[model samples]
Target chain A: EVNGTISIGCSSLIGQTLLPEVLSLYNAQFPNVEIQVQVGSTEQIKANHRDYHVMITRGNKVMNLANTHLFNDDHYFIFPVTKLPFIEFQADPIYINQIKQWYNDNLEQDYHATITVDQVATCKEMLISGVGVTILPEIMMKNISKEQFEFEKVEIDNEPLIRSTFMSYDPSMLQLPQVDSFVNLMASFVEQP
Target chain B: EVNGTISIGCSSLIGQTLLPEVLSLYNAQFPNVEIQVQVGSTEQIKANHRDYHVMITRGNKVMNLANTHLFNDDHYFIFPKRDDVTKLPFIEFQADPIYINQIKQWYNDNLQDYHATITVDQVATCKEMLISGVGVTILPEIMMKNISKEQFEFEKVEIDNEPLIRSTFMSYDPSMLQLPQVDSFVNLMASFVEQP
Candidate 1:
């Protein structure tokens, strides 16, 4: 029932994986509408003004970009063993401070200077090498073989580190029927559990 | 039957979405082995000397980081319906510095006053906006394969008369390749890409 092309830009994670599932249904309904998808960093997606008609990213706030929630990822305490040194990776100060405060409140008695690394990979490697443990989102372990690694998950007092991803776009584009329908379709996929 | 944890660091695009399907299959066969995926930029993945059993990226070569080819994507420009839309404002993809620079050079060469009125991260949005008459953009041809040319206007963008192309890589430390779990995952990834 739709005509014309629709371009979408999204975080690589969504573009590469989730969109295909949605697109299959979308294409079946609007077989005539062309959908082009590009995957990249959220930063790149936000800065983009003229490229995509619709944009999706991992966070809720975008300075000038208007967005709405599509889904969220849950957080987990991932470590090789229960008792190990903590290895920190450089992330947004807001997140770093929260983790630090959590550590101070609960695990400070057992705490020592944290070994900081620039990359998450290093932090994970440090855990496997028995150097320390780390906290990461559940999606990060989507492909992990649960039995192969003897890692443990600890729960924080907080409900969970809920990271909500949003779908953003130029308000003008929504007036287009295809874009609007696709956006609505995406919102329907968000399963709150 | 591998029975140890193998951590993988991948570019956000691969780690966030695509690898899970492949990992599920691998895990179903080797339930005892655990795989952890960490998503980051290609630069972050390549800089690691110790961390992660393997890494995935989109490029033919990662300097100082040895890699095996996983796949390739062709590059092109998605233009508006008009053939003479070259002088219009561009929608640049800035995640990859090389692409940003190439676009800058292209703008200069064409004597076009470059103003990316709309900049977006994901490729799909770029193409979508372009069709809405927002601006023009350069993108991978693979993504547009399903789109009929009759429905949209597009063309190959060349650098010094050469068509632009991009490749994805599965980068890793050679030493890590010795681990049975790491080796299995790499082969699994290779097979996944080839078949999928």
Candidate 2:
């Protein structure tokens, strides 16, 4: 408790999970350290500059706002352990292009789509029910409980595909002891999950 | 049963393991299918227009070469199960004022080399010799096995992580009716592997 508390602002992706891990582990070890978690999208949290000491969000678009990385995930096809015939993205052109490209080369059978969804959770729901196939990050896909969904290898070509999550803290906050400890603690967590 | 035989070429990535499964299932099913396996890079296989009824290789790079996507294998990472010391690459920047102008706005970790070898076999070897502490993490898109090496989590962060072997194929002998059978086989495989 150098002067006050360390506030961590995050989006839904990491907010629901990552922040708790950071706070519980780090806060427990350094009981003197005060931690706060403000959850929302990057835009929502930034609207109130008073809320956070650090910011975590998704997509490289946020690169302009941060300086560090925390994690990465890749896209995968999600489905239950059943045979369901369908295509993802509701036959959207960009998605269809991807599908056409896939069928032309691999299975030689074009994908048929009757639905498309925008949200990860919703798309996953459809996939698990075997209504259709949708692509999503492995982290998000793997989160489905074994009873709900089965994960499989859906590849366009395996070439070290990746998307990264970043950690950004205010530079002035770096001078604070709590901030420094958190940064170091983060580096030590290079383990894959 | 066709005018000519259907030759199926494979890259070294599938040489030792998956080929046998294809042989047992596909060859056994179509006893007259006349299947031959050519071993080499998916790129080399894709380039050889002179032979092979079909060719399978890993990497989207092959898709570009063939202007088609055959299939995508699930992406998997190879790592040691026990607590291992693995260092993800760090990029150091020069203090140049100009580059710095364009740098402070960037929020990504860049990998210095993309072709770094992170094969599962090598990773297994690393574990056996206790070299897993230094064993690099590799994504398996090109290979068949998924996460069998050890107890570890897979990650695909913004860091220019290594490429998983993407499984793709092209047909030089595209005119073969074994075409439908091959097509069905690929679909059957898609269904087979899609299950957990």
Which candidate number maximizes lDDT? 1
Which residue ranges in model 1 land beyond 4 Å of their true spot? A1-193, B15-25, B47-49, B63-65, B84-88, B107-111, B121-134, B145-151, B191-196
State the TM-score for model 2. 0.39
Candidate 2 residue B88 C-alpha distance from true site, Å? 35
Q: What is the lDDT of residue A161 in candidate 1?
A: 56
Q: Whole-model lDDT, candidate 2?
A: 0.47
Candidates' lDDT values, in order? 0.63, 0.47
lDDT (10s digit) by residue, model 1, range B65-131: 5678877665666665564675454665536778677767766675456655445444544554455
Note the DockQ of each predicted structure.
0.06, 0.01
Query: For residue B191, what is the lDDT in candidate 1?
Result: 78
TM-score of 1: 0.48
Considering every candidate listed, which one attains the maximal DockQ? Answer: 1
